[PDB]
């Protein structure tokens, strides 16, 4: 007859509420009326965990749902006051004579809304067949699909959330006021420094390479300083293909592309007289970085001056015995010929240095448009938006995936509002501009592939499983294994067979929506449009979580470290690539680099997008307990202690490196894409 209702309120700003809360307990035998949760003094203060003794007029049997109503106080002859938004963490019912019932919530309640909560026990559609519970699932997803809808942003792009401004978003997918404040303070302060220094308003060349060091007065990091110390070095130019900003392109080469006519004579110096180009190709010691996708891309106008982009090809040589990876040849065009020289390290100073810089510029355009924006933001959004629409609150995958979706819809809405719009940093200060970004995404979407998204398949495909000093791989694979083991445990707990995976209609709709809205129903993407086995499910889910956390962390963390010394990552180029050799000079080199304002505007932007604003949410840390059962909680503990072991391994490893790799240290990896 009696019931103890324990309720936890959020600690966030505004989490508390002055409004009155009432609950209706629904059971197999029936539903109770609205029951008040009103004790002496104020309840539902921010961070509060309070008990309420409630009594039901009659029996309800086994508890099924928990309907939570909220209404503002009611003055006689004045009506209600005003809605006071309330964030609820969880409910807990305790009937006689014992046995607790935990109802996880973790969402905002507003106005005359009604929160319907199931017991914390995760349940697939075929888990509990009670019609009251099936009705709850169906009506919930119906509401979700109405709340969060799709729209086409551009042709050939993945679809996105149908919201124009960040203000139109629901509270449940918004930045916390804390995180947002922290973010805008950091930005306003950063912009102020760069602005008052008059650098955002300087149209023209840097007076010298030395003046470019002024960036280190704005912001400063050891890795950024290190880039300036060694940017001219070949080993550093090459190593950044492995442990730098964009470590996903390098791949082993047994057959040199015909449009890249490197001869044995061109590489005889570096390789030595002991072998030849063909011999080393067969050895598997030669690797290639091909920015061909940039070929003929649309370019931007900066300060009324037409900008330029190359689409280079870089041949690299991995010297024996853990020696350095060294560049052999660079061609700055996809079309060979006398007007596109193959530059060697044996060329003069500025020819070779100019050639390398062009490749670094290609890395920028490629990284930010495809590796960062498309792969580490747009696809995670699709995963997020599909998850919200197709997987209900009580579904195991929702419980698993929901922390890895936090703020993703928010940050992307922000980008579409303030990043890739006219007048803003991309349009303003990048070489390829808005149309270039779009054109790249459009091309890449037509040849995307499931294997690149799954790290073990990615490393295998590119044939870089054994290349030394590849820390993005080394650390990335350990984390992937950890996530894969974590996911397989969760799947093993809830899905007893492959048939049980096939019959999950909600799961199949989830994969199908990602395939449709995310990858445009392209079979050539190699991405599943359905999941027929548990093995496939484990891999797919692992790919999602990994993409939303470590992948973004790996390609985001190094942005400022890489761009702070601008010659190491020029956002644009102001002259076309050289057509002859022996023309490059220091004066010409600076004339080719972007103007001061474009330089500092991009650096300002990348510095802000490198750091996770506000409080952190480390990978594998889930303060929101959606999983209330024991078995999933063990899996979380295992996943957490493993990440710690992986971390400690990375500390030891980095301790003996002049330039450590920290971008994949688990404590520094966010659960989701949020910046
Ligand atoms: C139109 C309104 C402009 C307001 C701009 C306010 C300036 C913001 O300053 C942030 C950057 O300044 C850095 C250092 O400022 C001095 C404080 O002391 C530094 C040592 O801790
Ligand atoms: C001075 C400009 C500061 C930039 C603030 C806007 C940030 C909002 O969008 C963030 C999310 O972006 C996702 C993808 O990022 C790729 C952008 O690349 C940087 C271009 O310079
Ligand atoms: Ca409030
Ligand atoms: Ca009270
Ligand atoms: Fe990002």
UniProtKB/Swiss-Prot annotation:
The annotation note on the cofactor reads: Binds 1 Fe cation per subunit.
**What reaction does this enzyme carry out catalytically?**
(5Z,8Z,11Z,14Z)-eicosatetraenoate + O2 = (15S)-hydroperoxy-(5Z,8Z,11Z,13E)-eicosatetraenoate; (9Z,12Z)-octadecadienoate + O2 = 13-hydroperoxy-(9Z,11E)-octadecadienoate; (5S)-hydroxy-(6E,8Z,11Z,14Z)-eicosatetraenoate + O2 = (5S)-hydroxy-(15S)-hydroperoxy-(6E,8Z,11Z,13E)-eicosatetraenoate; (5S,6R)-dihydroxy-(7E,9E,11Z,14Z)-eicosatetraenoate + O2 = (5S,6R)-dihydroxy-(15S)-hydroperoxy-(7E,9E,11Z,13E)-eicosatetraenoate
Q: What cofactors does this protein use?
A: Fe cation
Q: What is the effect of changing residue 675 to V?
A: Does not affect arachidonate 15-lipoxygenase activity; destabilizes the enzyme structure
Using the record's annotation, list all stretches that form the Lipoxygenase domain: 124-675
Q: Which InterPro entries match?
A: LipOase, LipOase_C, LipOase_C_sf, LipOase_CS, LipOase_Fe_BS, LipOase_mml, PLAT/LH2_dom, PLAT/LH2_dom_sf
**BP-aspect Gene Ontology terms:** apoptotic process; arachidonate metabolic process; cannabinoid biosynthetic process; endocannabinoid signaling pathway; hepoxilin biosynthetic process; linoleic acid metabolic process; lipid metabolic process; lipid oxidation
Q: What is this protein called?
A: Polyunsaturated fatty acid lipoxygenase ALOX15B
- Molecular function in Gene Ontology: arachidonate 15-lipoxygenase activity; arachidonate 8(S)-lipoxygenase activity; calcium ion binding; iron ion binding; linoleate 13S-lipoxygenase activity; linoleate 9S-lipoxygenase activity; lipid binding
Domain named PLAT is located at 1-123
């Amino acid at each position: 007859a009696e019931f103890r209702v324990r309720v936890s309120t959020g600690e966030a700003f505004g989490a508390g509420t002055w409004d009155k809360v009432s609950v209706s307990i629904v059971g197999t035998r029936g539903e109770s009326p609205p029951l008040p949760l009103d004790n002496l003094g104020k309840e539902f203060t921010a961070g509060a965990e309070e008990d309420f003794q409630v009594t039901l007029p009659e029996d309800v049997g086994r508890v099924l749902l928990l309907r939570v109503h909220k209404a503002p106080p009611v003055l006689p002859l004045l009506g209600p006051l005003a809605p006071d938004a309330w964030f609820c963490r969880w409910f807990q019912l305790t009937p006689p004579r014992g046995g607790h019932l935990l109802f996880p919530c973790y969402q905002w309640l507003e106005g005359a809304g009604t929160l319907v909560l199931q017991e914390g026990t995760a349940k697939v559609s075929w888990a509990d067949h009670h019609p009251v519970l099936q009705q709850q699932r169906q009506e919930e997803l119906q509401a979700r699909q109405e709340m969060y809808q799709w729209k086409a942003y551009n042709p050939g792009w993945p679809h996105c959330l149908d919201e124009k401004t960040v203000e139109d978003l629901e509270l449940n997918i918004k930045y916390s006021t804390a995180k947002n404040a922290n973010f805008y303070l950091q930005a306003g302060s950063a912009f102020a420094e760069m602005k008052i220094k008059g650098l955002l308003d300087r149209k023209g060349l840097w007076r010298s390479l030395n003046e470019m060091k002024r960036i280190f007065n704005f912001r400063r990091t050891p890795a950024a300083e290190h880039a300036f110390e060694h940017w001219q070095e070949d080993a550093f130019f090459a190593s950044q293909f492995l442990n730098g900003l964009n470590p996903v392109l390098i791949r082993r080469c047994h057959y040199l592309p015909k449009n890249f006519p490197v001869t044995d004579a061109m590489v005889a110096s570096v390789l030595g007289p002991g072998t030849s180009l063909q011999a080393e190709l067969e050895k598997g010691s030669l690797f290639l970085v091909d920015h061909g996708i940039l070929s003929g891309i649309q370019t931007n106008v900066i300060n009324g001056k037409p900008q330029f982009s190359a689409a280079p090809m870089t041949l690299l040589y991995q010297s024996p015995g853990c020696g350095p990876l060294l560049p052999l040849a660079i061609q700055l065009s996809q079309t060979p010929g006398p007007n596109s020289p193959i530059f060697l390290p044996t060329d003069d100073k500025w020819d070779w240095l100019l050639a390398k810089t062009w490749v670094r510029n290609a890395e920028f355009s490629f990284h930010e448009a495809l590796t960062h924006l498309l792969h580490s933001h747009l696809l995670p959004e699709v995963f997020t938006l599909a998850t919200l629409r197709q997987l209900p609150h009580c579904h195991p995958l929702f419980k698993l995936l929901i922390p890895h979706t936090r703020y993703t819809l928010h940050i992307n809405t922000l980008a579409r509002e303030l990043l890739i719009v006219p007048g803003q940093v991309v349009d303003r200060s990048t070489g390829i501009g808005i149309e270039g970004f779009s054109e790249l995404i459009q091309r890449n979407m037509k040849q995307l592939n499931y294997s690149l998204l799954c790290l073990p398949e990615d490393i295998r495909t590119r044939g870089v499983e054994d290349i030394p000093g590849y820390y993005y791989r080394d650390d990335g694979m350990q984390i992937w294994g950890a996530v894969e083991r974590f996911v397989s445990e969760i799947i093993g707990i809830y899905y007893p067979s492959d048939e049980s995976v096939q019959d999950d209609r909600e799961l199949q709709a989830w994969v199908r929506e990602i395939f449709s809205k995310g990858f445009l129903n392209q079979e050539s993407s190699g991405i599943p449009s359905s999941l027929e086995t548990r093995e496939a499910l484990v891999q797919y889910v692992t790919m999602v979580i990994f993409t939303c956390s470590a992948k973004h962390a790996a390609v985001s963390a190094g942005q400022f470290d890489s761009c702070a010394w601008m010659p190491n990552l020029p956002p644009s180029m102001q002259l076309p690539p050289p057509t002859s050799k022996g023309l490059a000079t220091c004066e010409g080199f600076i004339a080719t680099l972007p103007p001061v304002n474009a330089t500092c505007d991009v650096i300002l932007a990348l510095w802000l997008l490198s750091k996770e604003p506000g409080d952190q949410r480390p990978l594998g840390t889930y303060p929101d307990e959606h999983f209330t059962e024991e078995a999933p909680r063990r899996s979380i503990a295992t996943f957490q202690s493993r990440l710690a072991q992986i971390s400690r391994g990375i500390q030891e490893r980095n301790q003996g490196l002049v330039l450590p790799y920290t971008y994949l240290d688990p404590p520094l990896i966010e659960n989701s894409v949020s910046i």
